Amino acid sequence: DSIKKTLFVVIALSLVCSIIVSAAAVGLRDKQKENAALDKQSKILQVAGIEAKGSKQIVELFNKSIEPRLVDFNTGDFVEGDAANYDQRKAAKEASESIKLTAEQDKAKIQRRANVGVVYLVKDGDKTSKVILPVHGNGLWSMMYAFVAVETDGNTVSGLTYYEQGETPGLGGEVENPAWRAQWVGKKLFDENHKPAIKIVKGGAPQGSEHGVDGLSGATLTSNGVQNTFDFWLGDMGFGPFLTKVRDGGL
Amino acid sequence: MEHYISLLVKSIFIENMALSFFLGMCTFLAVSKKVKTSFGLGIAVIVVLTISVPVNNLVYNLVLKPDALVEGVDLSFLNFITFIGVIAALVQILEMILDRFFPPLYNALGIFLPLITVNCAIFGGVSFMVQRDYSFAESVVYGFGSGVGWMLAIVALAGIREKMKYSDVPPGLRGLGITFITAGLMALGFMSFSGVQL
Amino acid sequence: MITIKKGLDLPIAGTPSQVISDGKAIKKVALLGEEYVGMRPTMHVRVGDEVKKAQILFEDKKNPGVKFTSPVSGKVVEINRGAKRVLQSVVIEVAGDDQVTFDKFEANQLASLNRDAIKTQLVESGLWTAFRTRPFSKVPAIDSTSEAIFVTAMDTNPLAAEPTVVINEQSEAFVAGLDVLSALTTGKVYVCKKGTSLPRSQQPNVEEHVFDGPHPAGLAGTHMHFLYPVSADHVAWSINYQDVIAVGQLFLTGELYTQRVVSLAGPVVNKPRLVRTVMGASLEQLVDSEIMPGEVRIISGSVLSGTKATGPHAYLGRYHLQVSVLREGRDKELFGWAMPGKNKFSVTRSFLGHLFKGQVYNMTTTTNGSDRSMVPIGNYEKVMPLDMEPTLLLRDLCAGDSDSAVRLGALELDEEDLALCTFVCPGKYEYGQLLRECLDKIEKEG
Amino acid sequence: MSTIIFGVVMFTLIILALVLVILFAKSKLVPTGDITISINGDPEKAIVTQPGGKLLTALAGAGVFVSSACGGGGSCGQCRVKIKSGGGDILPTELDHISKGEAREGERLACQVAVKADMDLELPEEIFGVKKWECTVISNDNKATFIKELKLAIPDGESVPFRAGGYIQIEAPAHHVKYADFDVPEKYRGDWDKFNLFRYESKVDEPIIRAYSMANYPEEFGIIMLNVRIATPPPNNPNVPPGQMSSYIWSLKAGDKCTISGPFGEFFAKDTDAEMVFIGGGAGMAPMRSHIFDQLKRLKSKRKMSYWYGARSKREMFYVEDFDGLAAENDNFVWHCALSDPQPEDNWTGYTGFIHNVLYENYLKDHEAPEDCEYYMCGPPMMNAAVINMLKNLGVEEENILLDDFGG
Amino acid sequence: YEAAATLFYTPGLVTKRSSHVRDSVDLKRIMIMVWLAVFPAMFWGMYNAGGQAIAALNHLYSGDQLAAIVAGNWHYWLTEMLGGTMSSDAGWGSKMLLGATYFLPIYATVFIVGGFWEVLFCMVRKHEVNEGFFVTSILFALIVPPTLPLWQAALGITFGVVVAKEVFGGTGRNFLNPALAGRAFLFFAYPAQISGDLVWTAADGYSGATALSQWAQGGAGALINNATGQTITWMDAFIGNIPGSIGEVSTLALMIGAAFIVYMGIASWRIIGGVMIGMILLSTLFNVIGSDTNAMFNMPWHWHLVLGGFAFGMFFMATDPVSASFTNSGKWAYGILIGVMCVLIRVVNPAYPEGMMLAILFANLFAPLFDHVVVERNIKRRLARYG
Amino acid sequence: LKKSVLAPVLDNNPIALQVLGVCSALAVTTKLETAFVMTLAVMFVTALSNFFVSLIRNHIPNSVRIIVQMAIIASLVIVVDQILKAYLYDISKQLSVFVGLIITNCIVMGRAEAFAMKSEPIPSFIDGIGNGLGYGFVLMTVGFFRELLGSGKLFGLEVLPLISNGGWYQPNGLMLLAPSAFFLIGFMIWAIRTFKPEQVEAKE
Numbered sequence A: 001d002s003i004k005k006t007l008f009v010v011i012a013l014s015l016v017c018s019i020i021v022s023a024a025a026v027g028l029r030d031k032q033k034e035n036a037a038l039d040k041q042s043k044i045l046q047v048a049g050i051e052a053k054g055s056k057q058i059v060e061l062f063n064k065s066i067e068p069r070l071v072d073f074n075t076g077d078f079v080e081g082d083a084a085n086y087d088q089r090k091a092a093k094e095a096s097e098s099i100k101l102t103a104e105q106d107k108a109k110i111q112r113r114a115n116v117g118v119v120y121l122v123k124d125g126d127k128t129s130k131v132i133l134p135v136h137g138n139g140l141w142s143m144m145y146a147f148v149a150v151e152t153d154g155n156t157v158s159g160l161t162y163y164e165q166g167e168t169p170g171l172g173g174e175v176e177n178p179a180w181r182a183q184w185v186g187k188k189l190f191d192e193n194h195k196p197a198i199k200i201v202k203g204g205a206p207q208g209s210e211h212g213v214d215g216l217s218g219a220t221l222t223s224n225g226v227q228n229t230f231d232f233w234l235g236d237m238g239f240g241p242f243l244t245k246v247r248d249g250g251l
Numbered sequence B: 001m002e003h004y005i006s007l008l009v010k011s012i013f014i015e016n017m018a019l020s021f022f023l024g025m026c027t028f029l030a031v032s033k034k035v036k037t038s039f040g041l042g043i044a045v046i047v048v049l050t051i052s053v054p055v056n057n058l059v060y061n062l063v064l065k066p067d068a069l070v071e072g073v074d075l076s077f078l079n080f081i082t083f084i085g086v087i088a089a090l091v092q093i094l095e096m097i098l099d100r101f102f103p104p105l106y107n108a109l110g111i112f113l114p115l116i117t118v119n120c121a122i123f124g125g126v127s128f129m130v131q132r133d134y135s136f137a138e139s140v141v142y143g144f145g146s147g148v149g150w151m152l153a154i155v156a157l158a159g160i161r162e163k164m165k166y167s168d169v170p171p172g173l174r175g176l177g178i179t180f181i182t183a184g185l186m187a188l189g190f191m192s193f194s195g196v197q198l
Numbered sequence C: 001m002i003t004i005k006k007g008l009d010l011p012i013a014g015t016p017s018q019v020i021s022d023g024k025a026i027k028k029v030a031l032l033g034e035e036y037v038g039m040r041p042t043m044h045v046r047v048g049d050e051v052k053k054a055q056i057l058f059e060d061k062k063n064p065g066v067k068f069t070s071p072v073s074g075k076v077v078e079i080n081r082g083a084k085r086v087l088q089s090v091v092i093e094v095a096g097d098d099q100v101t102f103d104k105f106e107a108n109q110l111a112s113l114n115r116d117a118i119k120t121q122l123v124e125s126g127l128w129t130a131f132r133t134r135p136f137s138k139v140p141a142i143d144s145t146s147e148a149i150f151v152t153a154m155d156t157n158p159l160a161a162e163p164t165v166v167i168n169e170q171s172e173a174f175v176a177g178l179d180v181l182s183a184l185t186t187g188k189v190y191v192c193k194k195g196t197s198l199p200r201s202q203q204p205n206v207e208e209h210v211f212d213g214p215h216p217a218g219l220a221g222t223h224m225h226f227l228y229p230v231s232a233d234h235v236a237w238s239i240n241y242q243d244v245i246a247v248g249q250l251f252l253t254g255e256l257y258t259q260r261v262v263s264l265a266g267p268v269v270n271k272p273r274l275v276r277t278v279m280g281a282s283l284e285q286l287v288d289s290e291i292m293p294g295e296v297r298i299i300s301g302s303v304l305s306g307t308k309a310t311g312p313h314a315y316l317g318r319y320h321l322q323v324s325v326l327r328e329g330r331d332k333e334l335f336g337w338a339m340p341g342k343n344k345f346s347v348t349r350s351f352l353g354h355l356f357k358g359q360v361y362n363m364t365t366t367t368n369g370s371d372r373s374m375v376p377i378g379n380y381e382k383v384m385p386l387d388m389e390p391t392l393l394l395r396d397l398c399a400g401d402s403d404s405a406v407r408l409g410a411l412e413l414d415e416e417d418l419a420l421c422t423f424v425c426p427g428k429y430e431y432g433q434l435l436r437e438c439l440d441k442i443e444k445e446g
Numbered sequence D: 001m002s003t004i005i006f007g008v009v010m011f012t013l014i015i016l017a018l019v020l021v022i023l024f025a026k027s028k029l030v031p032t033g034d035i036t037i038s039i040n041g042d043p044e045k046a047i048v049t050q051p052g053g054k055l056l057t058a059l060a061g062a063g064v065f066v067s068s069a070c071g072g073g074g075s076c077g078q079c080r081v082k083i084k085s086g087g088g089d090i091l092p093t094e095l096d097h098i099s100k101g102e103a104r105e106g107e108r109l110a111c112q113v114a115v116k117a118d119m120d121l122e123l124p125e126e127i128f129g130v131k132k133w134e135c136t137v138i139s140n141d142n143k144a145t146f147i148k149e150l151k152l153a154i155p156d157g158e159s160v161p162f163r164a165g166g167y168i169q170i171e172a173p174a175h176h177v178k179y180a181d182f183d184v185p186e187k188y189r190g191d192w193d194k195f196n197l198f199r200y201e202s203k204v205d206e207p208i209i210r211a212y213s214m215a216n217y218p219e220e221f222g223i224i225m226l227n228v229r230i231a232t233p234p235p236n237n238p239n240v241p242p243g244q245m246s247s248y249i250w251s252l253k254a255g256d257k258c259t260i261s262g263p264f265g266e267f268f269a270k271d272t273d274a275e276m277v278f279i280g281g282g283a284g285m286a287p288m289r290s291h292i293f294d295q296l297k298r299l300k301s302k303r304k305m306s307y308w309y310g311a312r313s314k315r316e317m318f319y320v321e322d323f324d325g326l327a328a329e330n331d332n333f334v335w336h337c338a339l340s341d342p343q344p345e346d347n348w349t350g351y352t353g354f355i356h357n358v359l360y361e362n363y364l365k366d367h368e369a370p371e372d373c374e375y376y377m378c379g380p381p382m383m384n385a386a387v388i389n390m391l392k393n394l395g396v397e398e399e400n401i402l403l404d405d406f407g408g
Numbered sequence E: 001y002e003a004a005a006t007l008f009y010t011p012g013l014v015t016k017r018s019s020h021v022r023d024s025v026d027l028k029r030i031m032i033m034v035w036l037a038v039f040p041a042m043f044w045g046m047y048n049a050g051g052q053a054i055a056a057l058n059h060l061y062s063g064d065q066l067a068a069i070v071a072g073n074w075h076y077w078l079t080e081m082l083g084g085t086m087s088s089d090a091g092w093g094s095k096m097l098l099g100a101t102y103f104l105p106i107y108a109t110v111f112i113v114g115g116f117w118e119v120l121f122c123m124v125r126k127h128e129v130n131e132g133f134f135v136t137s138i139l140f141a142l143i144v145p146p147t148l149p150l151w152q153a154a155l156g157i158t159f160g161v162v163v164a165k166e167v168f169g170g171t172g173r174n175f176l177n178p179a180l181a182g183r184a185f186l187f188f189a190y191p192a193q194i195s196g197d198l199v200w201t202a203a204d205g206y207s208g209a210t211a212l213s214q215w216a217q218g219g220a221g222a223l224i225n226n227a228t229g230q231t232i233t234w235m236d237a238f239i240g241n242i243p244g245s246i247g248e249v250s251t252l253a254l255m256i257g258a259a260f261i262v263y264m265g266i267a268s269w270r271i272i273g274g275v276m277i278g279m280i281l282l283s284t285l286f287n288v289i290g291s292d293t294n295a296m297f298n299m300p301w302h303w304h305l306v307l308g309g310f311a312f313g314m315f316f317m318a319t320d321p322v323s324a325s326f327t328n329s330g331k332w333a334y335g336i337l338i339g340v341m342c343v344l345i346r347v348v349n350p351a352y353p354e355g356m357m358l359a360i361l362f363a364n365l366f367a368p369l370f371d372h373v374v375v376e377r378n379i380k381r382r383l384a385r386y387g
Numbered sequence F: 001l002k003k004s005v006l007a008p009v010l011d012n013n014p015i016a017l018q019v020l021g022v023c024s025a026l027a028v029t030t031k032l033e034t035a036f037v038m039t040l041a042v043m044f045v046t047a048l049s050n051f052f053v054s055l056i057r058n059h060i061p062n063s064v065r066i067i068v069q070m071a072i073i074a075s076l077v078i079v080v081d082q083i084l085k086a087y088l089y090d091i092s093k094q095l096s097v098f099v100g101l102i103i104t105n106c107i108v109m110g111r112a113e114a115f116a117m118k119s120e121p122i123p124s125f126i127d128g129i130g131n132g133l134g135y136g137f138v139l140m141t142v143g144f145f146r147e148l149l150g151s152g153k154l155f156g157l158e159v160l161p162l163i164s165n166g167g168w169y170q171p172n173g174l175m176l177l178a179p180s181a182f183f184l185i186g187f188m189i190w191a192i193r194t195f196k197p198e199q200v201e202a203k204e
């Protein structure tokens, strides 16, 4: 019958293509995962202040100096777990691991906050010199993600880096400008009364201020985004309890 | 109810498939000569996409999703072949059903079904669906809205090209060049919904 | 009553005096061969041939059996041929008084005659060319029939004559022509007139429909669109009141009636009035010593739809009932386009001339501008009473889409139906020629 | 290796299920019965076909050969049929070649109709009477430097019934012919030797079908006379191959075998008492001779006729004897020949120049009414264009200009 | 000098065919009547630009700082040289000088570049250069901030003339608005010289928001003029004592100019009424349903009219005959869509303060479909033998 | 021969003459590296698909021909996707959806149907490489122009010093958006049909 030839052709073709596809796919999963992790590793290395070129140097210096850890937002305590492969965005998406935010608390317009978040500790020897808090917030066209490196004293910022911004490349995408990023080194997060104090000043910052950093020019709708991002992720439902525990002592 | 109105209006206006995502341009730029054939092709695309998105959602969530069948087994590398096969099979079977049982519907819009058996619009729709992780009802609404937006765009371009019978285009741009420039001006116009977040 | 509100009564100086006075002697007539739409003639005469009245001059190759006969007896003196030997006129010099006569009936019997006998006498005499079908404005085939025959007993053209003045003179002939049409008209006859009473036909086929409004409220195309819309399947014939008088006289007396009463008027005519003439008379002899000194244009018909009567075409057309003379304007003006026009006419309101009411203008033949593209500022809508989309149909005519124009209503129009649209165009387009091209394409492809 | 097995099995299963559902939907919801092609409503003759195929190929495999010349790609446009109810659509090439006047009555191209519905045809009675013939060659003698006369012999005491002005197609097997094998006399061999055409040759692999116009009026029985020209490579590219069927016919000699297939025609003399004007040139002498001899012998008409033949030189003038006989016996027929460039050996005392200009200057300029005549025209494309231009300039309607263009 | 033979003198031609008498109007009369209607807007725009600049300058600097600042900018020292003054007591003449120093270079650049491109195209296609470019040039030069770079104006007018109009066959043969397609080129390409707080008052070092950006942030109580420290009233935006694009600020002047071209039959009162209907309906709906966080949800219909470039575009740019709808009902639908989209982009779109160029560019795309619907409803009436 | 490779570059161009292949040309031309990688991937997939379809041209059933051809094409594109994800991870993240849309790319299927089913294995490879070159011509031209004018960079190398990194050039923000690709391709078509006037589409 004519069914025999068509069935034979289809079966043989599917067998060959299946062997080839499934052999090529399963064989490279480990390389794909390594590549996926390498980008975030390089970003955290760049924020921490370390210099590394190439996959080998990146992986070596990341295993040497940086130690990922999980922290509970509601209580500000470290929790045991596999902090290396934790995925905070899926943790926020899933309902059992996240909470819905009210309009009085959702200052950063994220609409969902996870219960456990990862923080990276920069270590020189046994002592921890910096903690790299991951923060994010909404802007005018997209959700902006950042890596802020807070020193051990709990206030002084040692750097900033936006690794996912998605805004106009010459108005509000200046959050990736090296000068704007370097404007952050030395600023203090909290005031004397342990309150959030970072201020995105519109029109220039008074030279010498510790809480003032220059706002973006021609983009006040994406400077409000950074201001609200820090207003939320420095508050009581963000890194507030953890930062209080760090400021007290015993990082 | 308010969650699906947002998806409908989004897929129709805020995220156009033709002018914003550039899906299916060859037929969009070739069959745009007459409003009648453009309307027929738009209806065909609406039907095919509305049928194709939810069936592929079912197949994905049942088989291809990580750990769906057996824990620790991820068969996500079959997404492309599975989607394209389901699309082609559904298109062919619908073409045959309409040609046999409903000759009027066939001579109306089933004449276009061979053109969209393998079209970037539907494949990109299914890919965006698996990227955005829609439920079944969200897949239905997204497919319908995307089809309606594609049809609106192609019918607008057909109306413009039929108004352009009074134009005097240079010989080098007569044909494809002026159509490209017209679609570009249409995208420049459709950029009105840029800042909206629906 | 059908009341038209979208139109334009063009104010032009020289409105004629509605009294009929005898006219100057005519010594040459002619049959203009280019005014008959889609005709290719077979000449039955030669230069130097003595003819009699209603003797055949040429036949149509495309319309088998239609005979074009001489208006008067005389001698064929010219056969003017243009570019590609296209016929322009057959000029006959009036002489003698011979004629070809036919069968005469009593006025009682005219409504009961047979359609075949009526058709036979009409085609033998040459009044079959008085009809014009719609669509395509051609002479009807001798083997075809029509349900709607429209008699145009009104005239809204500028400087036009008054139908009532002539019908009050030959009421018996008008009624006889109506009664003959009643037996030729298998469906019906429509006598489209104004509010003023006319002679009446006792037959129930003959109906009197009153139209009231500015131009084009007196056009057979408007009458057809409002009483019997035409298409490829439904065709209607149109004859005017003077040709109906002539048909009545023919069927009553047995001899052709070639007399005409036309309107000689214009901004450059000394004493505008109505004059008695003969079909196809010589216009350069008709306006001899009745024009102001200068350079003028003589036109057969109105200024909206006429024929420049110079040279071989300086003869009264078949379907024209007036002569319009107006000065020829070629002068250049410094910043004339930007003048506040107290003496300038427009359908827009960008001039001061619209503020003064009842003003008549000494218009000339100037195109007040140069040819440009169509920027539609809403002009063609103010002058189109019919139920069409004016600017879309005109833009499809300009583009050259004949199928789209037939869809949008080009099969209901004559070159006289777009005269106001040609008038009010800021791009100086001419839509009658484009309509004729579209209709030629439609007639050829089929 | 635990994922690879699931991958191969899942891929095979999905593809197999898709293929099987496709086949199952095709089996049930696609018809496979029979379709009847009623070629005419009156007779019982109807053809049963499967839905897969073409209307033209179906009619051919049945045996009713419609009139076509090229045999493919709609380049001919002669495979016309009238369908009352059949394949309900019209193709762009059909819009290109026919008008809406042919649509309403039901005419349609036989080449591009899809046979999936029950069809009702109305063919002209001419298509029924087209027999496939076998013939022997009587003579293949030259008449001009590039024109060669082929006289076939129709067997079994029958004559092809055809109107004057028709044609018959010719078939040929695959072959390979040498130009040196041509039989060319020494008088016409001049330009042959001078251009060195004998180096050419032609090779074909498949049966070929070309058409040629009969050169005798139907009363001349038993003989089929043709006039074929040698279609040498054009002077722009002398490197291309030569003509196939022209070389085949030039290869044919006495006693050989060749086939002709049915009388066709679309170029006939109109019925009227009007003056006739025959404008011929090149190989158009064949239909022109058919027409004139038909008129003067079979119908015995008294219409004022004329003939104007244009050649290059007196060497290319043929058929002078019978035309002198006709012009002498009848006072209706008068024929004039015009030489483009006569040689010194010609000793020519007559009309010289291009035939359109000669006709216009000598006849149509002083003519009373050139628009009342019937014009029959057939020759080279340059002559056709020039004469059509002259006639259209003289105010002549396309319904008087009757034209036959060799492979238009 | 061959152009002076065409522009100064009447052509001097006669008719040839069916209509032996023509109407006195032509394209030149129409285009110059539209070019003259925007002159009050242009002059008030120059005056307002000069006045706002002088006020913002005397607000920031004083004494020795004013001299050093006016010695820097050629606009300011050229005003001082020609005879005006930059002090706070400057009359209406010193302000129009300062506004002309900003408007005239932009207008000259736009005119020269667009004229070059149009002359090139009309020379290559063997046509005569037609009016209809004066309107595009003047509109593009008046819908742009007082502080555009001249190379940006050149690029924008190049894109507007060549790509939007001249590449389709000239005037009357395109489907898009050339002047608003050249501003959409500059808005999406170089969007910082045409947006924000530093481009609208031509004062060196002055940063201030306009009133469709101050309403969004705080409402009707946030309409404050920082230069003078005074509240912005409705009579200020209506008359036009507000910052913005050169000649869009004076709704009174725009009404005075547009009333003439509407009376004369050039502009479409159907399109204007459609725009007003659409904006009133949508603004009333937003005012009814209301919202707490959004402060544009409570802007009345008579505040939408006087702020932004609504009146400029409703009066002079929506009424473009070539890009509008050719049917009398399509015109109503076109205007309604323009107004609806303008109010929508104003209220629910957070990135763009207004929406009149982006609403007209949408309606330019969707007008042929309205004409199609109307003509198709008309054809069914003909097949039924009632038309 | 060599003409079989070099004719689809200008004489019969995919994007510029036979509309096939527009959806990726509009999208992936914002960056020259992505344009180059897409050109290479399209060449690879089209050539190998043509080769295999021509190998099995005779045994392909008619009712499931599309399924067989699309199975081969999808296998090729899936292998390409798994290779790119492992060795060029940054390019694939930007090429996210059009890597998969290589399957529905009209060039691959149109060449597998028009030329592969009716030709030999070796010439099909040549036709595929030629059509890939013709695709990459337009891809690389539009990518060059867009990346140069809109970012001042070529392949990521600073060619024009941007004004924010203390320079003289201010980039074009429209060369990163949707409209610019349509205009670039339309003007490429104009410039192509100017020098080759046999491609001009006759009136009406």
Ligand SMILES: Cc1cc2nc3c(=O)[nH]c(=O)nc-3n(C[C@H](O)[C@H](O)[C@H](O)COP(=O)(O)OP(=O)(O)OC[C@H]3O[C@@H](n4cnc5c(N)ncnc54)[C@H](O)[C@@H]3O)c2cc1C
Residues within 6 Å of the ligand: D069, D167, D210, D211, D212, D213, D227, D228, D229, D231, D232, D233, D234, D237, D240, D241, D242, D243, D244, D245, D246, D247, D283, D286, D405, D406, D407, D408
């Ligand atoms: C109704 C009708 C009647 C006809 N009557 C006659 C008649 O009486 N006499 C007559 O001679 N013809 C007649 N013809 C024309 C006939 O059909 C042929 O067209 C003609 O005879 C030439 O035949 P052929 O063998 O050369 O055909 P072909 O071999 O198909 O034609 C080849 C011709 O084309 C040229 N050519 C082919 N390929 C190329 C190439 N690649 N580059 C350049 N040139 C190339 C050759 O040089 C040669 O001239 C008639 C046609 C029709 C339709």
Ligand SMILES: CCCCCCCC/C=C\CCCCCCCC(=O)OC[C@H](COP(=O)(O)OCCN)OC(=O)CCCCCCC/C=C\CCCCCCCC
Residues within 6 Å of the ligand: E234, E255, E258, E259, E262, E269, E272, E273, E276, E277, E302
């Ligand atoms: C169509 C021709 C061209 C356009 C010509 C338009 C002429 C219109 C008539 C002249 C308008 C003169 C209006 C003078 C305003 C008087 C000032 C006044 O009394 O107050 C205005 C008062 C509101 O004041 P508040 O701001 O609320 O003050 C308190 C603050 N909360 O009401 C108004 O705003 C009046 C609106 C101004 C006139 C609007 C004119 C319409 C514009 C042209 C549209 C054409 C008509 C189409 C209308 C379509 C309607 C469906």
Ligand SMILES: Cc1cc2nc3c(=O)[nH]c(=O)nc-3n(C[C@H](O)[C@H](O)[C@H](O)CO)c2cc1C
Residues within 6 Å of the ligand: C375, E030, E031, E034, E132, E133, E135, E136, E137, E139, E165, E170, E171, E172, E173, E174, E176, E177, E178, E179, E180, E261, E266, E267, E316, E317, E318, E319, E320, E321, E322, E323
């Ligand atoms: C009432 C009227 C309004 C016009 N508005 C514009 C406009 O907004 N932008 C423009 O470029 N041209 C405008 N023009 C000029 C003309 O319409 C424009 O050049 C056409 O678009 C030519 O294609 C206008 C003309 C008139 C008569």
Ligand code: FES
Residues within 6 Å of the ligand: D056, D068, D070, D071, D072, D073, D074, D075, D076, D077, D079, D111, D112
């Ligand atoms: S004959 Fe086969 S296609 Fe025309």
Ligand code: FES
Residues within 6 Å of the ligand: B023, B024, B025, B026, B027, B119, B120, B121, F020, F021, F022, F023, F024, F104, F105, F106, F107
């Ligand atoms: S790429 Fe060819 S159709 Fe989408």
Ligand SMILES: [Ca+2]
Residues within 6 Å of the ligand: B010, B011, B015, B142
């Ligand atoms: Ca969507």
